[PDB]
From a paper:
The structure of SaFapR in complex with the DNA operator revealed a strikingly different overall conformation of the protein, compared to those of the ligand-free and the effector-bound repressor. The crystal structure of SaFapR in complex with a 40-bp oligonucleotide comprising the PfapR promoter was determined at 3.15 Å resolution. Two SaFapR homodimers were observed to bind to a single DNA molecule in the crystal. Each protein homodimer exhibits an elongated asymmetric conformation in the crystal structure, in which the two DNA-bound DBDs are structurally detached from the central dimeric ‘hot-dog’ EBD. The amphipatic linker helix αL plays a major role in stabilizing the molecular architecture of the SaFapR-DNA complex. Helix αL interacts with αL′ from the second protomer mainly through its exposed hydrophobic face (including residues Ile59, Val62 and Ala63). The two DBDs from the asymmetric homodimer interact in a similar manner with DNA. The recognition helix α3 from the helix-turn-helix motif penetrates the double-helix major groove and makes extensive interactions with the two DNA chains. The SaFapR-DNA interface mainly involves the DNA backbone phosphates, except for base-specific interactions of Gln41 (from the recognition helix α3) in the major groove and Arg56 (from the linker helix αL) in the minor groove. Importantly, the insertion of the guanidinium groups of this arginine from both protomers promotes the opening of the minor groove, inducing a pronounced local bending of DNA.
Numbering used by the authors:
A (entry chain C), C (entry chain B): 4 to 189
B (entry chain D), D (entry chain A): 7 to 189
DNA sequence: GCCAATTATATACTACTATTAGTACCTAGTCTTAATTCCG
DNA sequence: CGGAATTAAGACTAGGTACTAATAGTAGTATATAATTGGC
C-alpha cells in the first residue's frame, strides 16, 4: 500500500544501488524498488546514470588503462605525501568497521596496519620487509577520527632502514612506532 | 594475403591486445566478411565484445574488506580464559605482496593482536604496547598457528607472549601489553 | 518529413524560448516544436525548468521584493563603481543593435547615452538635470567592443556640478565629454 | 471578533500587504470558512492568487529597447538633402524620469544626432563633435519638433545647427560636427 | 569439377533510448445549490 | 423563531506532477540455412 520511498528518496537509493553494483539491470531495480521499469529508466536519466552496458564499459576501461596500481590497492590508508627514503604521510579515516562495536575505540591492528603500510611505501627499494617493530598506543583512537600517520627514516645500515612513525588525531599523538625494515637492492 | 589459420592467429592476438574491438572493426582490418570473424571467434573460443568487456570489468571488482575493517583475524581454535589461546590463519593471495608472495607485516600482527583480545576474559581490553619480531618469511598458502600465553598480570595490565608457527617453525614472536578494566 | 531539431538541440531551443517568455505554456511549446506535450514536460524536467505557475511566481517575487530599482532599469550600460559626487564608472557592451548595419560602427547617441546616464548616477542629489554638454568622438567604437566610461566631478557651484567623462575601449580614449549638471536639494 | 464589513476591510489590507497569500491562509488567520473568504474577495473585486501573482509579474515585464539599441530616434518629417531636415518625437513614459516626469538628457540628443545622420546624404556619416544646450525642461506628453540646418561644409566635415521646440518654445539647441566620406 | 571456405539473408535476442500516450492525483481555485448556524 | 450570514457538498477547471505503458528504433550480437566463390 504505502510505497515507503518517494521520488527523491527512491532516486538516491537507486543512485547508491548502482554505485554499489554497476552490473545491476533496470529489471532488477524495478523489482527491488517496486516501481515500473519506465520509472527506473526515468530515474537513471535524471541522475545522469548511463545504461548497464555503458557502466560495465567504464568499469572495464578503468581496469584496462591500469588506473590505481597494485601498490595502491594493498595499502592501509590514503598515501598523501612521499619523499623516497626520507619522510612519508598517510591518512586513515576510522569507520565503524575499524572500531570495537561496544566501546567505539579502534582495534590495535588497525593503527599498526597503517603504520607498517606507510613504511613499505617510504622505502624506495626492490625488496622491503618488516623485521622488527616496537609500537605504543598513547591515546584511544575513537570512531570518526582521522589518523594522520607520519613516518621518518632515522637511520640506515647496509641491510636495514630504521623508521619512526608518529600518528596523530587533530595534533594529539595517539600512536608511536619504531620499525626495522630490511632492504635488498635485488 | 592472410589464409584461414594465419588470419585467426592474428585475430586472437588483436582481440588480446584490444578486447574493446568490434567484429565490424576486425572485418575492415582483415578485409573479410563479418560472418567469418563470428566463425573465427567461435573456433578460437573468444566470446562476443559485450561478454569480453564484462570479464575485464569483473576481474578488477569483488574487493574483500582490508585487514583494518576485519574484527577477529584468523580462526580461533582453543581458549583458556586469561591463560592460553590459539588461532589458525591460512595465508591467502589477499594477505601476501603480489610481487614477492610473502605475507604483509600487519597480517601476522593482526592475528596476534586479535588472539590477545580473545584470550583476556575482561569487560574492556585494549592493546597499550607491543614488541614484535618477524623471524621467518611467511609465504603464500602457509597456515600460521599462533599461540598466546599470559606471562604476567598487574592491576591495570596483562602481559602476553605470542609465538606463531608454520608447521614446527617459529616465524613470529610478539610481546603484548594489554590494558584491562573490570568496569 | 524530418524534424530538423534533435533531442539536445530542441532542449536548448526550449530553454531559450522559456527564458525569452516565461509565460509560455507546455501546449504552445508542443505546437512550436512539433513534438508531444509529454516530450515538452520531459525536456523541462531535464533542463530543471519549473512549471508555468512556478515561473510566473518567480517573476512576480523578483518584482515584489524590489530586486532591481526603477533607476537601475532607466540606466544606459552597467554601473560598476560609484563614489557619490566624486568618481563613477559604467560599462557598455556594443551589440549589433548599437552599431550602423553597413559600417559596424556605434551610433553617436549610444556613447552619449552611457555618459549622460553615468553623470545622473554620479551626483547624489534629489533633482539632477543635464543643462549643457560638450562631447567629442576621438576614435570609432566598433561592434563587440566594451566601452569603459569614467566620470569625475571637476567642479561644483551652488546650482551646478561640472563632470568630465572619459570613455575607453582596451585603454584607448574613444570619447571625451564635459557635463554641466544642474542640482537642487529639493 | 471581526464582523462582515470589518473582516473584509482587514482581508483587503492583508491581500494588499501580501498578494502571495492563499485563501486557506486567510481562512486560518480570520477563523472563517474558505467559502466566506471566496465570497469576500468576490465582493471586494479581488481576483484569485494565480491571477494576482500574474498581474505582479506582468507589471515589471514587457520592456522596449533602450535608446542605445534604437536606430532612428523620432519620426522623420521632412528632408532636403545636405540643406534642412525636421523630425518629431512624442515624449512617452519610456523617455521621462519616472519620479520627475522630465525627459532624460540623452533622449533629446538622440533625436538631434539621428536627424543629422538623416540630413547628410553621403555614404559614410559619423558624429565627431557636439555642443548641446538644454534650454527648457521637456516634460511627459510633449512633442519635440527638432529642426537641423547645414551651416557650413568643409572637405572632411558638415557643420549642423539643431533647434528643438515644444509648441513654439526653444527647449534644445545643438551644434554638430559631422564627418563625411564619399567612399 | 569438387568440397572447404566464405559470404549472403533471414530470423531472433538483450538492454536499452527517444518518443508518444494516458491515467490518477494535485493545487487553488470556479460556480452552483443546499443546509445550517449566529444573532437580534 | 426569522433572514442574513456562513459553511457544507458536489461538480468542474488549467496546468501541471508522477507514474505506467507501449512503440520504433538501436548495437552488437546470436542461430541456422542457403547460396556462391577460390583454391587446389
Amino acid at each position: 500500500e504505502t510505497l515507503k520511498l518517494k521520488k527523491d528518496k527512491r532516486r538516491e537509493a537507486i543512485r547508491q544501488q548502482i554505485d554499489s553494483n554497476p552490473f545491476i539491470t533496470d529489471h532488477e531495480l524495478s523489482d527491488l524498488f517496486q516501481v515500473s521499469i519506465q520509472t527506473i529508466r526515468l530515474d537513471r536519466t535524471y541522475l545522469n546514470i548511463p545504461e548497464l552496458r555503458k557502466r560495465i564499459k567504464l568499469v572495464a576501461e578503468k581496469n584496462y588503462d591500469q588506473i590505481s596500481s597494485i601498490e595502491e590497492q594493498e595499502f592501509i590508508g590514503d598515501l598523501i605525501q612521499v619523499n623516497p627514503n626520507v619522510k612519508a604521510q598517510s591518512i586513515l579515516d576510522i569507520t565503524s568497521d575499524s572500531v570495537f562495536h561496544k566501546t567505539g575505540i579502534a582495534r590495535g591492528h588497525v593503527l599498526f596496519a597503517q603504520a607498517n603500510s606507510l613504511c613499505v611505501a617510504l622505502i624506495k627499494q626492490p625488496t622491503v620487509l618488516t623485521h622488527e617493530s616496537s609500537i605504543q598506543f598513547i591515546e584511544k583512537v575513537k570512531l570518526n577520527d582521522t589518523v594522520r600517520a607520519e613516518a621518518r627514516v632515522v637511520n640506515q645500515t647496509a641491510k636495514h632502514y630504521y623508521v619512526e612513525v608518529k600518528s596523530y588525531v587533530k595534533h594529539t599523538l595517539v600512536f608511536k612506532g619504531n620499525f626495522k625494515m630490511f632492504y635488498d637492492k635485488r
